[PDB]
Amino acid sequence: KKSFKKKYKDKAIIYYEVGKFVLNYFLNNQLTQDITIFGNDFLNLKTINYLSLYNSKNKILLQLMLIFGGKISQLLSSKNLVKSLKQASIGMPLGQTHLLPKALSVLAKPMIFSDGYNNQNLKTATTLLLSFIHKRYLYRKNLIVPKLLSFADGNILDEPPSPPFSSLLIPAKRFENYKRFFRDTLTGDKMGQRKS
Amino acid sequence: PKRRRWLLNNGSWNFWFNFDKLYSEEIVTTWILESLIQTYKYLHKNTELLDFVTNKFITLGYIAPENANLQSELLSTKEIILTNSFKRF
């Protein structure tokens, strides 16, 4: 029992890093066609600013390849268990009882042990791409017009400042009843309650 | 304190401004898929190298997931091994 579970876990863990380093080495020492070198894989904020503000699109695509090599390697090496789970026994996709057993194995996602992504990789990827879009105004320069300018959406129209500036206590007195209303009607006191 | 910037709820749901979220999202999704596809297309032609390097890495040693309770970079034996495997396969 534990033997097979450990086999699956270990296979996934090993194939991850094997693919990660294989892609690192390839991109650094073989696309260039003196000394063999390796990367360090960490993207600072300084590095993200530099890459997104001064490099072209192909450079950013190379960085993303570096990020996703490990997951793709895990993908290329996993056994799809649907075949054996439906063979050794035989409205929902498991209700169809016909369709030659090969064309039946595509009605839903394959049963791969290691599914989903790691959250650090996703954070890095989306931050890099969001910087490229929002800070480097190419192909759309008119979207700078709504920059550091508010439009007063949800609030009281004219409100004076508060004690740190003005010794006036009416806005805070109303804010306290606002919070009472929130707790008693909308949210509750802990995540999961219908009300207070 | 209500919201006062209603702009459209006839074929979508929009509020004043936002113009800039469809462009952003389609760009992000397109670029991520292109990168993943290039990675897949490269690793798809080098499966033997993957099998070999994996065999070697297993027999060298690795930190089991449950033994470790409390690999960003490669050691030096593993670097010799990776360079050789790239030269052979």
Place this chain on the structure above:
Amino acid sequence: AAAKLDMTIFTEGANSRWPYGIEWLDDAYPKPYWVQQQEAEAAEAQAKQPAA
């Protein structure tokens, strides 16, 4: 004639009723109740005056 302004005034004239000259107001807001009442009384006024 150069001493004139072109400051646009939105709710001027025909634009003094429900849309108030906003083109997109009917795609964002349901029509209020008093606005429907005003439309009703105005319609009956200008639709019995052809008989009056």
Place this chain on the structure above:
Amino acid sequence: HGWHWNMPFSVKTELPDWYKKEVERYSY
């Protein structure tokens, strides 16, 4: 044949014309 687990999808929206004018003004 039958379905495939990886079929393309689509989202249907109907925007008015003033909205398309607005989004084409800031698309430059």
Place this chain on the structure above:
Amino acid sequence: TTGFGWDPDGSLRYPFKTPDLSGARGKTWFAGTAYDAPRNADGTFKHGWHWNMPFSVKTEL
């Protein structure tokens, strides 16, 4: 800068005035119907996509 600007067709204004499903590319999973994935001018899928990849693609219409 009075008199300068862009015309609605795109031109500057100074102050005064189908895919080919012929060969094997036509035998893919749905290949012609409305459920097919968007293609290029030569018959390849959009971003080099293939029905193997782990994420779906969005149809234009």
Place this chain on the structure above:
Amino acid sequence: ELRLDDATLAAVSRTLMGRLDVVDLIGRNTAVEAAERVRDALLHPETRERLLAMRRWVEGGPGAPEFPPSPLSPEQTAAMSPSGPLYGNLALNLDWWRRRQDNVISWSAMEILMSRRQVDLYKQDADMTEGAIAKLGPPPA
């Protein structure tokens, strides 16, 4: 030909809908939808009998039959025991159990988590303009 009296109607309804004298507090549309569901829950006895048994166990009178009947015949229950041809299906993903496959997603949340009948019945209680409400349900408009 089916014969139905007050008691069976009351029991079926109280199992399927709840208290039976709040038709005004919940609107006539909710009541009409519930009536459609109840009418469909009759018109074949394999469900009607189970509903009556559940009702009589809940009320807990003298004839509480110690439990309601199971939803599955004792045949499919064996065809899914470990010595069965369908045991493996209990191990597939949650992607093999989904009862709905939609390839066009609508701009409205009402059309995603409701049935077409429910939408055509309920869409008049929405907080949208008339031009929006006229875009939901049967395209007849």
Place this chain on the structure above:
Amino acid sequence: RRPNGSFKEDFFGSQRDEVHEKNQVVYQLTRHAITHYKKPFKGDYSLAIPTNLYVTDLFLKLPTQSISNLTNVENHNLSIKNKI
């Protein structure tokens, strides 16, 4: 930094300054904000030029996103923040 604010003449009506002084302040402020960007000793570590603030937000913070389409929130996905 040892310890302008217009919120006094909006809500508290203080208005203890002559009209010519207020006008002069306004003139100098517009000219300073617009034409002293990137000028030696005159346009410097100054918080009255919006472009300096844009630059610091462009090289220090992460990309800021637009407002949301939810209700009961302020403009972004958050509630009103404390007054004091």
Place this chain on the structure above:
Amino acid sequence: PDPIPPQLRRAVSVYEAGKALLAYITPDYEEIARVSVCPLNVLTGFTLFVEDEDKNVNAILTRSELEGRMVVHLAGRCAEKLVMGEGQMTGMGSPDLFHANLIAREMIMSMGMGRRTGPIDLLRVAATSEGDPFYYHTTDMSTEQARVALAEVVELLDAAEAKAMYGLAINWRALQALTQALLDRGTITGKEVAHILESNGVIHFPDPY
């Protein structure tokens, strides 16, 4: 005597029976420590699971484990719906509903397990400065993206409900025995519920891995 009416005791007992049954037959779940229905006539019911210090939170969460937890959470509502009928379902199974929806949103918007959204990151758990231990960091989405994500969340929850219904329907005798034990005894521990379930032919879910 009994301060509590009959039908309330029945409803709470069926809820706890369903939840304990499905937490028992699910591979790799925690072990039940106690199951009580209105102890000391205090109007309440619960199902404690034994807390251990062996669980290392650094280990990742597979997809199978998350789906199993979702099913365990929908179990009690499904048991009520199956035994007593829709019109008698109360709102007592609300925290389980909240946690099921939380898991289903995190699988789609935070781990990229949805085939249509892709590997985009839109949620971020975060811990408070020490109410609750945690809150989230969200992202402003458009209507297109939000609808595409809602479709998948709804599919996941519907499939989880169906699997829970089947896992309960094929164990009807064990469910009956357990709810009768709860209706007459009021409180059970882990060993006793394990024994009651084994002596009635309980059917465990497989584990493909």
Place this chain on the structure above:
Amino acid sequence: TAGDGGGLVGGEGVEGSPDPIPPQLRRAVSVYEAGKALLAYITPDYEEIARVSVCPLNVLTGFTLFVEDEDKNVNAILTRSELEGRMVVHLAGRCAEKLVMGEGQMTGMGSPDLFHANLIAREMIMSMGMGRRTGPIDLLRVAATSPFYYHTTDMSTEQARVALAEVVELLDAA
């Protein structure tokens, strides 16, 4: 550079900043600065150029040193001709980079200059009443600070539409 941020200087060695400033990234700064100085030279009544530099102190921008006259607008005057000229000069660099190095290989180097131009167009419409359909009325407020926001407005949405359309067409003319 003040924290984990950074991204502007270009000669320190660390990951963010390369050592010799690649030549493809120096040609672009030369094009940017050439366009900006050429536009500032052919505009009548603009300030006068004292020095034009490329990557001073290794920063990844240009720099042009303008000397002006304090006996013409005595730290207080701002006509309309001056403002329009400044807008044109600040957009010149972006336009030259796009015209020479292709529309796809542009960089973020001119991203602050862009915001400066926009800012002028904002003040000309919402704060000085040089707008035609908006007329002479004051709209903006400075949010008292210490998502960052510098201005604030509470005009209705139907007036915000018009004001922003005017800002956009000013920028397009420039």
Place this chain on the structure above:
Amino acid sequence: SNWWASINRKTGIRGPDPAPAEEHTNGPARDII
């Protein structure tokens, strides 16, 4: 000539001289540093 008459922001802005799109790249690592 008068190429500056046929400048069109819809179909792309471009100059007369032939697209100096020359470029090169070492690895991502030897380009970060």
Place this chain on the structure above:
Amino acid sequence: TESYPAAVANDIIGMGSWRLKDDVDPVIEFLVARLEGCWREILDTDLCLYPREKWKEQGWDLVDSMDPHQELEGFSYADIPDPAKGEAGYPRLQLENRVYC
């Protein structure tokens, strides 16, 4: 840190990354895994891959009958569904090779 002998490693790998697995009978899976395991474990200090221009550029590492010209770049095992009886193609043939020196 834990290690494993070579036999256990090549047993964990199995039919490692063959692109046509999931279609192979378990007996053929077992035999291929064992044979390639002995190759990788015994000859490991000199095992190379056969030169790529001799077999792998002609497209002979994965051959499909429904696509004899490789206009799907070797994903024909996934893009093209199986032809039904009597259609032009029945029966489909797939081959996968591995060659070492």
Place this chain on the structure above:
Amino acid sequence: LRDRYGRVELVERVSIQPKGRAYSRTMFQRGTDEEYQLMTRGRLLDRIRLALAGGFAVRTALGEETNFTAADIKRATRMAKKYVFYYGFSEAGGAGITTWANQPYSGDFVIGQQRARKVVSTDAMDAFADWPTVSEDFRFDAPSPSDVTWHRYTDEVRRVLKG
């Protein structure tokens, strides 16, 4: 204006000698305190016109817009709001009574100062007609308008300024 209705005062002394903080000055002759207890409608209209006059004169002489307008409209806009909301002189609604208004607060709330200056020409002298709020538990603030009412109210302000 003094020679058409008779509300404005008389000019006293014009100067463009930079002196103090300003570069130019224009002084008026103050009337008795009886004049400054009230604020009628005509007097406020005249104050608005006087606020606009400076920038519009520079523009009509120089032939070109400047930033001088910037300092006028600001002042003017403030007064115009007070003309429409607080005092209720306009025609917003058929009479001039709107559903919302912003009454000032006393200067005690601020963290004040002290200087050796006299009272400002008008803006601190015409602040004698306000009656600010002093106690906090008797303050009234109607519910804010609804961005379709706000449209019409700000449009009334615009009409006043344009006239």
